[PDB]
């Protein structure tokens, strides 16, 4: 109502349709008294009420779809679940996921990331696939438990775009996102290609560019630990037999 609390946001901007445009930071003032508690709430309010040209991804609005991942106050997170910092003395800086080709504004081109995911064959593979569809495969509570902390990934790419290794060798290093998923299939008690899944990582980059920086785990919006999955892979990588 009456008695505002104006917060400033410096957001990255780049129009691929303004010939010869240069990335620039634009600042927006928002009244937190007439805005939802989340940064996405702020981003939407801005596009709706001050600059409908501010472009970005969003959909779910509850942190499950992974669409809105961006860099807020130097860290990768989901705009839709990151509380706006109430300290009016600070201007929150919003950038696109780091080291990514910017398609427009806060929208990164994630196709390489998607292709990397495709490359590890994230889907159940059984030697005999002659019986697909006749009966539920059996999996114990204990084996289904090993999947917790792995299946929840929403493929948001915050962790991978936070890892310096992926910043320097993203073309060959799969990244925490995809690697954890590769591990997600390695330990599914129902999959029969564990050895082949490891074989695919027998090169200097795919997996071994991880030097345990742990930015990934710190940045994960779902509280997942890709960094640890990666280390379990290394232990398998170095114990499996042909």
């Amino acid at each position: 109502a009456a008695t505002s609390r104006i917060k400033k946001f410096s957001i990255y901007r780049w129009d691929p349709d303004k010939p010869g445009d240069k990335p620039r930071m634009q600042t927006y003032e928002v009244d937190l008294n007439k805005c939802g508690p989340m940064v996405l709430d702020a981003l939407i309010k801005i596009k709706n009420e001050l600059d409908s040209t501010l472009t970005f991804r969003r959909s779910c609005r509850e942190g499950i779809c992974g669409s809105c991942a961006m860099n807020i106050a130097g860290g990768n997170t989901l705009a839709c679940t990151k509380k706006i910092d109430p300290d009016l003395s600070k201007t929150t800086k919003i950038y696109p996921l780091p080291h990514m080709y910017v398609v427009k504004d806060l929208v990164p081109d994630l196709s390489n990331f998607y292709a990397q995911y495709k490359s590890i064959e994230p889907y159940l593979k059984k030697k005999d696939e002659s019986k697909q569809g006749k009966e539920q495969y059996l999996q114990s509570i204990e084996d289904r438990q090993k999947l917790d902390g792995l299946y929840e990934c929403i493929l948001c790419a915050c962790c991978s775009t936070s890892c310096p290794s992926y910043w320097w060798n993203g073309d060959k290093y799969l990244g925490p996102a995809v690697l954890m998923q590769a591990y997600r299939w390695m330990i599914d008690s129902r999959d029969d290609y564990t050895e082949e899944r490891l074989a695919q990582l027998q090169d200097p980059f795919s997996l071994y560019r991880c030097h345990t920086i742990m930015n990934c785990t710190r940045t994960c919006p779902k509280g997942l630990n890709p960094g640890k999955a990666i280390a379990e892979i290394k232990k398998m990588m170095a114990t499996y037999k042909e």
Partner: protein, 139 residues
């Protein structure tokens, strides 16, 4: 459809010839102790290696043998302070890199991955680094 390898290839092809800018990273990313201790582990390893390489080079190139250089220095009867300061500075890198290297070996065993334990192991590393250096620079 397009295979993953095909997609990666057009991704680079498309973008490297585009007018699309690269979003910033190292210049805008928020640091943490873990991150900082991690690259420091790199800088120290490298420095230890360049140090070990300068030593072997000198063993093959300098006219005089080690004992003479040691003497030369003892003949300057330098302030212990400076003596201690140099020794400390000498062993810090090694100490930091050693303790933190043990940290990495523990991680390689797959232990200490909870983010809060990463912060713990690191701080322990930092104090052990500080203590071992002081101890040694004093020996």
């Amino acid at each position: 459809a397009t295979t993953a390898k095909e997609e990666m290839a057009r991704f680079w092809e498309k973008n490297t010839k585009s007018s699309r800018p690269l979003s910033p990273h190292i210049s805008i990313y928020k640091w943490s102790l873990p991150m900082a201790m991690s690259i420091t582990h790199r800088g120290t390893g490298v420095a230890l290696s360049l140090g070990v390489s300068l030593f072997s080079l000198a063993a093959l190139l300098l006219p005089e043998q080690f004992p003479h250089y040691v003497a030369v220095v003892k003949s300057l009867s330098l302030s212990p302070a400076l003596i201690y300061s140099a020794k400390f500075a000498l062993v810090f890198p090694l100490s930091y890199h050693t303790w933190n290297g043990i940290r990495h070996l523990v991680w390689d065993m797959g232990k200490g991955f909870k983010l809060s334990q990463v912060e713990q192991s690191g701080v322990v590393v930092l104090i052990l680094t500080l203590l071992s250096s002081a101890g040694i620079a004093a020996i």
